[PDB]
Amino acid sequence: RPALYFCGSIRGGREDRTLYERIVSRLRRFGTVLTEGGDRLIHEQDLEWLQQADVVVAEVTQPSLGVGYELGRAVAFNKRILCLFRPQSGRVLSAMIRGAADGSRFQVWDYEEGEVEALLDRYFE
Amino acid sequence: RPALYFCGSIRGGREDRTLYERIVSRLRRFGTVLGGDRLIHEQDLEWLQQADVVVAEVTQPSLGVGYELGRAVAFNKRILCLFRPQSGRVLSAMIRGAADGSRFQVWDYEEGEVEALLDRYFE
Ligand SMILES: O=c1[nH]cc(CN2C[C@H](COP(=O)(O)O)[C@@H](O)C2)cc1CO
Ligand SMILES: O=c1[nH]cc(CN2C[C@H](COP(=O)(O)O)[C@@H](O)C2)cc1CO
């Protein structure tokens, strides 16, 4: 069973918090979600988990410095990465996330919110 | 004269675009300011590897700015982040918590003083 790291906006805004809870609930079916002192403790503890993770899953619809930073560190750690983006939000996903995808180790999937459990099923089965 | 890489929100929102222009204008006094989205990512990743200092205005939340800062840390780059409390926001723990006060600095500042702050950092 893989160790999993979930990323989603917090101080960038909690608009998608209920969706994040759905994603984490589904990820727990497959493995251990590691992400579930001030800000330094948060950074250091999360960097520890990010190196431990087998897969990094990020919901990248809501813009967030912390999510982007986690993804940048994860790429440099050579982590397998799954990013999930909702075009129906009306946003354009950052070129630094869209353009980081190599289609294998770093995947970016566009999706509709109702399908997120099914999409995670497809990725983790 | 350093090679300088500037970061500021675009697709996260262009609210601070005028301020970014002021920062880049002042940075040029101190050094060189360096398909599809893949070309942008690859181009900018090359510049960021070529940089001596990465300067980021981190007030507007942005995936791309955060990603640039994460890649910059792993590229062992010198980093200066600039945050405005007048925005009313609480800056990301990942940026505030990455700071070490030396090679990764996070400064709170008021918009009117950004040129003086840059003058101080770049001597
Ligand atoms: O309270 C927190 N708990 C845990 C974290 C670590 N990551 C960052 C990212 C949100 O980044 P952001 O939107 O907050 O910038 C999430 O994936 C969790 C950050 C904070 C506050 O930053
Ligand atoms: O058009 C572009 N030109 C150049 C870039 C590279 N960086 C990312 C960051 C903004 O990131 P973001 O807010 O767009 O996510 C800026 O520092 C420039 C990204 C885009 C569109 O993403």
From Swiss-Prot, chain B:
GO terms for cellular component: cytoplasm; cytosol; extracellular exosome; nucleus. The chain holds residues 20 to 159 of 174 of the full protein. It comes from the Eukaryota. Induction: Expression is induced by ETV1. Inhibited by AMP and GMP. Optimum pH is 6-7 at 37 degrees Celsius. Its EC number is 3.2.2.-. It comes from Homo sapiens. It catalyses: 5-hydroxymethyl-dUMP + H2O = 5-hydroxymethyluracil + 2-deoxy-D-ribose 5-phosphate. This is 5-hydroxymethyl-dUMP N-hydrolase. The lineage of its organism: Eukaryota, Metazoa, Chordata, Craniata, Vertebrata. 5-hydroxymethyl-dUMP binds at G8, I10, R11, G12, S62, G64, E68, S92. The gene is DNPH1.
